[PDB]
Symmetry: D2
Subunit: 295 residues, 4 copies
């Protein structure tokens, strides 16, 4: 037998960083959860009890904190690139570093209509994420995403004209609820190294903001034919607004809200045009995916 | 043996309701999770297999949906009072109804700076809750709360002057992070019935808004001596602003963020005035509680 | 305003302890999560920023570990009593200690049919818990429980003869699935102090074992008229087998499994006597409670 | 722009099935959660609002239940193969079906030492899973796994000889706790279709049982040099015992249990040979992966 694939490292590393402007008093906070997994000439740790090739996961943890102390942690695409580059540069025998970062929201509070210098609210469980793969001789591959953006529209969603056969019970509808948890990922052009990543730094926040804005506006404004048709519109708009993106991926649950027929009770009308009270369904759920690129 | 206490009903009933203004096109959505547990002359269902005394939990579920169809679901204090009153009025042998409602956030989206007529975002996992106990001959007892309001301040929190003995390792501090998940409950004067609840309806939203505003402003502005001292200030302010409240309760975790000494690595300074990178601790956590009333 | 109630302490303290028999080589492990909340003459910490009255939560954490080092951690009723007694004895101004312990399963592995001396499996997420309230001048009040014991029976459950009115849609049944997550609590006679608790130590494990055995056998063997009727039988049997218990409480969800009518598809018969495939319902759920004592 | 990848279907479909032996009275239950995602000539649903190509997710759900009614649900490798084959055979334009099944434990109860005919316990949250990819013209690719198997050993784990540099603080150890949640996956030889899968049916349960037995015995008996070295031994043994497997993958967290130095308190000795009380760490955690194949 032989090792066909191996990677190892530290997961679930919680990290907070504060920036303090001593002149103005304004403080800014960042909070993340980090995973770093390494690949390289490590097979003998598995096959021969050779720990000499292992950079201890505890040391990887230390390195995450040290790197956060010595560098900006934002945008996460940059921080992940710095962190990944460190491992392949420091350790000859390590040839890839896979860095995942989940960024947690700490939005500055407004108190009596003024932004507070050092108080923050977790205004959503929505995350901003990166997956940064630094592979020796193959540059830096970055996938950026937003996830856990939970939305609902109460009308201007439709679903009709789908295939109907002996397995089909679903009624066509011209007016339904649509609710989802948005997971949207944009995949960057390969970067040659850390200089090229740095050269594009403003594009990371700008493209996240575009992706979020497009997602929300398209969801709100599209009189949706299906989840498929709506998500495609989102993806094509994001591609049109950032040429350094190669693909956009969406993964969207269809979180169903069922009508409740109450006509058995005193003739109460709660379906069709009279539908007001619905049963949110926890499971099952539709799950709709696509990856859009340029033609 | 004998039944000393018993209650039963339906838990985890998810409910959505939409309001549609046909004139303006503006739709408004409400989403809840409801629990109704009943008490009364039901002991023989337990002791004698006498199901005749059981209003089926499935029927309780139906009743929740019917009541939501026929009544406003907001404020939740009112909806819970209507729902609880129904069971003690409809069923002679039922003498108490215990209604818990968790209200989920669906905040109207702003698209290109304008409120959208039918699209919403789950802008926080913060909840607004009620616990409405309708007890025959004893009126309606309402506890209102907000929960899951997660906040952090990066300075202007202190903790010194605490007891020090042979069990103490904690260093005094004059500048630390404070983060919590706020659970705040206000307990209303007993109401005699549904007419009295209705007579105070505007006070429910107003008092929730006050509790939230006071919580946030006090957290942000108090140069905190301890969680204890800060939460007391919140409670006393809320009591001062609504005379129909009898008590205010807070339950606050102290979600610790630990300094990370990095001086073992190249003399890096990351403690005290130089502390920038911290380790958020998932557990354990301080837990600080108090109930404040009038003197 | 004034403090009507207050308690504070450390929650979510994870604790592991190992016992090593050096003669035999057999090791035994214990793992818990502990919460200790204190009450006493602490109001000035809330009202006057008086931290002198606060035993720091960090110190409470230290004390949990020290107490575990110096004492048995089993049975949890004893450990909680020792821990709670410590705080009211050590600190004049502390007058109650509220100790909650959740015990996690680490069941010894059998390898090739022989018990292994130092390897364990989490064989269930079922917990054994205690709530120990040590109140100065009022002894030690102990509630013991098992929770998260998830069971299902595929027949020999019935539900008919329940109240039927204009809110009722549920069909009577003489053969259904019954599934629940058992939460069972037995409340001990008040103990005067730690000597009396110690004097009954073997009864704690024995009564937990009885409660579990009775729960499982009654669930399996009772041709159940309702959740109410079955749980009452469990409680009365446990009371009959331990005179130092005063009450037994059950809280049982009815985790519904719905039939699926498939007759619209090629006349497939999947209801009544032909029911084989069911839809487990995540929510809502019945919730059935009772507390049984002696007559 | 163009669709580079797309798949869609129904996730989180809970399914129960009962088998009743009318002769013996013995009933046997199965419970799963199923996901089916389809690929094919579906791009126009995304690009042109063409729903004619969509087999509704609701219909996919119906099909899961119908297929469970008409076929065995065990072993899950077979059920998933039947289910996936159905979609590519029934719908000309569907060219792949991706079926994920999570099997939940319902272990028959023993009551008074005898197996009960119709009562079951969730004896572990450990799962048995399959991932069955049925791809038209490319047969059936099956990955089988066990997950959520949580174990701990209290000694006979070591970690020394790892790389030490300026990022390293971890002390070498010759005696530590090792705890993990086992996720083990075995990848089958490609099967040409459903006849070939059926021809190997007994091997599915047998290989799951082997994987579990090997995992537990190796964990318990290996005086472990590292997680890496132990997991490799597991994988090579499983490969040796089933020639129709091509690879075995493990993904193992190192769930750390930290010593607690208590020497600051009355000289208490709780480290090294005197270590009895430990602090389980919820995060971060090592994460160790490898895929082993034949040479
Ligand atoms: O039943 C279905 N209803 C749906 N709605 C939709 O927008 N697209 C689908 O493909 C569908 O996904 O959930 N299938
Ligand atoms: O160690 C402690 N640190 C704390 N901080 C605080 O504000 N009050 C406490 O009582 C304390 O709660 O967490 N105990
Ligand atoms: O609809 C109901 N079905 C039930 N079954 C039961 O055993 N008792 C109830 O009171 C019931 O609880 O779930 N209500
Ligand atoms: O600090 C470390 N300690 C570990 N133990 C181990 O068995 N292997 C590692 O590579 C290690 O993973 O957790 N890194």
């Amino acid at each position: 037998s032989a090792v066909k694939a191996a990677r190892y490292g530290k997961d679930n590393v919680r990290v907070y960083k504060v920036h303090k402007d001593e002149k103005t008093g304004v403080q800014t906070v960042y909070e993340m959860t980090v995973c770093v997994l390494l690949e390289g000439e490590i097979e003998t740790s598995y096959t021969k009890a050779d720990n000499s090739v292992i950079v201890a996961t505890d040391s990887i943890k230390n390195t995450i904190y040290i790197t956060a102390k010595q560098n900006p942690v934002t945008p996460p695409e940059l921080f992940g690139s710095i962190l990944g580059t460190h491992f392949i540069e420091k350790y000859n025998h390590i040839h890839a570093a896979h860095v995942n970062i989940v960024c947690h929201r700490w939005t500055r509070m407004d108190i009596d209509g003024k932004p507070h210098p050092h108080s923050f609210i977790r205004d959503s469980e929505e995350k901003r994420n990166v997956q940064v793969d630094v592979v020796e001789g193959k540059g830096i591959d970055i996938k950026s995403s937003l996830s856990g953006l939970t939305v609902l529209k109460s009308t201007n969603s439709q679903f009709w004209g789908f295939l109907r056969d002996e397995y089909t019970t679903l009624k066509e509808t011209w007016d339904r609820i649509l609710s989802t948890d948005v997971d949207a990922t944009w995949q960057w052009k390969n970067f040659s190294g850390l200089q090229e990543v740095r050269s594009h730094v403003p594009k990371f926040d700008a493209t996240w903001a575009t992706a979020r804005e497009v997602t929300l506006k398209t969801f709100a404004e599209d009189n949706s034919a299906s989840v498929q048709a709506t998500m495609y519109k989102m993806a094509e708009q994001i591609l049109a607004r950032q040429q350094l993106i190669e693909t956009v991926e969406y993964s969207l649950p269809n979180k169903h809200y069922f009508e409740i027929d109450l006509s058995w009770h005193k003739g109460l009308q709660n379906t069709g045009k009279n539908a007001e009270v619905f049963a949110p369904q926890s499971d099952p759920n539709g799950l709709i995916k696509c990856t859009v690129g340029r033609s």
